[PDB]
Design a protein around this motif. Structure first.
Motif, PDB file in Angstrom:
ATOM      1  N   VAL A 168       0.779  -1.214   0.000  1.00  0.00           N
ATOM      2  CA  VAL A 168       0.000   0.000   0.000  1.00  0.00           C
ATOM      3  C   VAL A 168       0.805   1.254   0.000  1.00  0.00           C
ATOM      4  N   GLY A 169       2.120   1.214   0.050  1.00  0.00           N
ATOM      5  CA  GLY A 169       2.997   2.407   0.070  1.00  0.00           C
ATOM      6  C   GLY A 169       2.805   3.346   1.233  1.00  0.00           C
ATOM      7  N   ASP A 170       2.454   4.602   0.992  1.00  0.00           N
ATOM      8  CA  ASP A 170       2.229   5.679   1.932  1.00  0.00           C
ATOM      9  C   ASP A 170       0.990   5.603   2.833  1.00  0.00           C
ATOM     10  N   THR A 171       0.040   4.760   2.528  1.00  0.00           N
ATOM     11  CA  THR A 171      -1.179   4.621   3.345  1.00  0.00           C
ATOM     12  C   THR A 171      -0.764   4.209   4.767  1.00  0.00           C
ATOM     13  N   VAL A 172      -1.407   4.910   5.693  1.00  0.00           N
ATOM     14  CA  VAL A 172      -1.232   4.709   7.152  1.00  0.00           C
ATOM     15  C   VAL A 172      -2.010   3.462   7.567  1.00  0.00           C
ATOM     16  N   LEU A 173      -1.298   2.509   8.123  1.00  0.00           N
ATOM     17  CA  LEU A 173      -1.921   1.279   8.645  1.00  0.00           C
ATOM     18  C   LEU A 173      -1.955   1.247  10.182  1.00  0.00           C
ATOM     19  N   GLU A 174      -3.123   1.527  10.730  1.00  0.00           N
ATOM     20  CA  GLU A 174      -3.313   1.475  12.202  1.00  0.00           C
ATOM     21  C   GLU A 174      -3.576   0.055  12.608  1.00  0.00           C
ATOM     22  N   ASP A 175      -3.241  -0.306  13.848  1.00  0.00           N
ATOM     23  CA  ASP A 175      -3.428  -1.679  14.349  1.00  0.00           C
ATOM     24  C   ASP A 175      -4.654  -1.703  15.230  1.00  0.00           C
ATOM     25  N   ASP A 176      -5.347  -2.822  15.319  1.00  0.00           N
ATOM     26  CA  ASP A 176      -6.521  -3.012  16.151  1.00  0.00           C
ATOM     27  C   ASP A 176      -7.470  -1.842  16.166  1.00  0.00           C
ATOM     28  N   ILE A 177      -7.920  -1.434  15.007  1.00  0.00           N
ATOM     29  CA  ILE A 177      -8.857  -0.302  14.871  1.00  0.00           C
ATOM     30  C   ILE A 177     -10.166  -0.666  15.551  1.00  0.00           C
ATOM     31  N   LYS A 178     -10.645   0.243  16.389  1.00  0.00           N
ATOM     32  CA  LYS A 178     -11.947  -0.049  17.049  1.00  0.00           C
ATOM     33  C   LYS A 178     -12.975   0.969  16.640  1.00  0.00           C
ATOM     34  N   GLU A 179     -14.121   0.483  16.276  1.00  0.00           N
ATOM     35  CA  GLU A 179     -15.310   1.255  15.911  1.00  0.00           C
ATOM     36  C   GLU A 179     -16.505   0.536  16.503  1.00  0.00           C
ATOM     37  N   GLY A 180     -17.137   1.176  17.491  1.00  0.00           N
ATOM     38  CA  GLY A 180     -18.296   0.483  18.136  1.00  0.00           C
ATOM     39  C   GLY A 180     -17.725  -0.815  18.737  1.00  0.00           C
ATOM     40  N   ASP A 181     -18.415  -1.924  18.526  1.00  0.00           N
ATOM     41  CA  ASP A 181     -17.892  -3.189  19.111  1.00  0.00           C
ATOM     42  C   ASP A 181     -16.954  -3.948  18.164  1.00  0.00           C
TER      43      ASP A 181
END
Ligand SMILES: NC(=O)C1=CN([C@@H]2O[C@H](COP(=O)(O)OP(=O)(O)OC[C@H]3O[C@@H](n4cnc5c(N)ncnc54)[C@H](OP(=O)(O)O)[C@@H]3O)[C@@H](O)[C@H]2O)C=CC1
Ligand SMILES: Nc1nc(N)c2c(Sc3ccc(N4CCOCC4)cc3)cccc2n1
Length: 192
Positions: A168-181
């Motif tokens: 993915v190059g420059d795209t920021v990859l966050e770990d364990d993304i949480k949204e609601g449950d």
């Protein structure tokens, strides 16, 4: 374009790999939709763009004012279609391979859905990478689902995040993304 490497990109709920319910994703993951957009749109070469391939039913499910998906060549597959360039952003085709014969100045190719497309094209040897967002929820069973991936993952290898990042190059990859449950992570797989 001749025998390009193609990637499938999907979001699935572990462990059953549920992907929908009566034509819709059973969740609304705002960050995940953003990642889908960035990955399918960004290119590294100059005068290029990526192509997105979808089944006729998914096309039809996008509100008319929101189609074609901007900044990408849209290809729609139907068994009833003739191979034809509608405009510079839309192609109609009856096979993945036939559609690719109509393009030039494409950097990457992604299959985007739906269920029948995923399930049939996973067995096409042009498919070289899977970008699977693995979603987790405390009570997976509480989420109503009717559609599932039928992917032969015993024949695929999950790569380390370094390989995805490279992908993915420059795209920021966050770990364990949480949204609601829901908690999710992005993954890359290649064929053994
Ligand atoms: O339930 C529903 C969900 O639909 P869902 O499965 O997600 O929809 P998809 O987005 O996967 O669309 C499925 C449609 O795609 C076309 N298509 C599917 N497989 C192929 C193939 N292998 N080659 C050519 N055309 C293909 C057919 O269009 P057509 O029916 O127009 O042939 C098929 O009905 C609501
Ligand atoms: N990682 C990833 N992959 C996709 N491919 C995405 C789509 S495109 C899409 C199209 C159809 C389906 N579905 C499968 C069967 O019917 C329910 C809808 C799912 C995603 C839309 C938003 C976010 C996405 N995220």
């Amino acid at each position: 374009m001749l025998k390009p490497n193609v990637a499938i990109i999907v979001a699935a709920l572990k462990p059953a790999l549920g992907i929908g319910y009566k034509g819709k994703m059973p969740w609304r993951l705002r960050k995940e939709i953003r990642y889908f957009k960035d990955v399918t749109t960004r290119t590294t070469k100059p005068n290029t763009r990526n192509a997105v391939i979808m089944g006729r039913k998914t096309w039809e499910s996008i509100p008319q004012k929101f189609r074609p998906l901007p900044d990408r060549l849209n290809i729609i597959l139907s068994r009833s279609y003739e191979n034809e360039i509608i405009d510079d952003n839309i192609i109609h085709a009856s096979s993945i391979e036939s559609s690719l014969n109509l393009v030039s100045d494409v950097e990457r190719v992604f299959i985007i859905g739906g269920a029948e497309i995923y399930n049939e094209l996973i067995n096409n040897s042009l498919v070289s990478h899977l970008l699977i967002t693995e979603i987790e929820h405390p009570s997976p069973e509480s989420i109503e689902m009717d559609t599932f991936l039928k992917f032969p993952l015993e024949s695929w290898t999950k790569q380390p995040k370094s390989e995805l990042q490279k992908f993915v190059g420059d795209t920021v990859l966050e770990d364990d993304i949480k949204e609601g449950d829901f908690t999710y992570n992005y993954t890359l797989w290649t064929r053994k």
